[model samples]
Every structure is written in C-alpha cells, then in structure tokens.
Target: YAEKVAQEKGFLYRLTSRYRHYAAFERATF
Candidate 1:
C-alpha cells in the first residue's frame, strides 16, 4: 500500500537523517 510505503520511508528518513545531514542513506545505495 502507498500509505505503508510512505510510513516506512518516513521512518527510514528519520533514521538516516541522524546520520547524513541532507538526505536518506538508502538513496545512495545501489
């Protein structure tokens, strides 16, 4: 579901935000 994906993305965003200052770390992965 779109909502589920969004929530997962949001959680990931929050998590990675603590590492990188700009964007999510997953964005850089292959």
Candidate 2:
C-alpha cells in the first residue's frame, strides 16, 4: 500500500540521523 511505503520511507530520515550521531561520537573520540 502507498501509506505503508510512505511510513517506511519516513523512518529512513530518523535512521540516518541516528547513524550520524554515532559517527560524530566516534570522530570525537579519535
């Protein structure tokens, strides 16, 4: 369904944001 697909895509932004946080943390430690 279109609604389900939209919902899945919406989580991508948040998931990318979460990965960014981890990247920054790792860089800070280095």
Candidate 3:
C-alpha cells in the first residue's frame, strides 16, 4: 500500500538509522 503511494508520488523511500535504532520510512528525492 505504502509502496504504491510512494511510486505514484515519485518519492524515494528508505530506512534511516537516525530514528534511534528504529527503522522507518524516510522520503526524499534527487
């Protein structure tokens, strides 16, 4: 579900290490 939205919005999603050992979806674009 989330992946589909990201794809449609052209967002780059990934896990970030800055969330205090918790992996979460971070969005960015280049």
How large an RMSD does model 1 have?
Answer: 7.2
Give candidate 2 regions above 4 Å deviation: 1-15
Candidate with the larger lDDT of 1 and 2: 2
- What are the clashing pairs of model 1? none
Give the range where candidate 3 is weakest over 10 consecutive residues by summed lDDT: 21-30
lDDT by residue (1-30, candidate 3, tens digit) is 245543555634423244323323343331
Question: Candidate 2 — number of clashing residue pairs?
Answer: 0
Cα lDDT tens digits, model 1, 1-30, are 124444667766555444454334444652
* Comparing 2 and 3 on lDDT, the stronger one: 2
* lDDT by candidate, in order shown: 0.47, 0.55, 0.38
Task: Give candidate 3's TM-score.
Answer: 0.27
Q: How far out, in Å, is residue 26 in model 2?
A: 2.1
* Tens-digit per-residue lDDT, 1-30, candidate 2: 123543667866545665567657755675
TM-scores for every predicted model: 0.25, 0.34, 0.27
TM-score of 2: 0.34
Model 1 segments beyond 4 Å from truth?
11-30
Task: Give the Cα-based TM-score of candidate 1 against the true structure.
Answer: 0.25
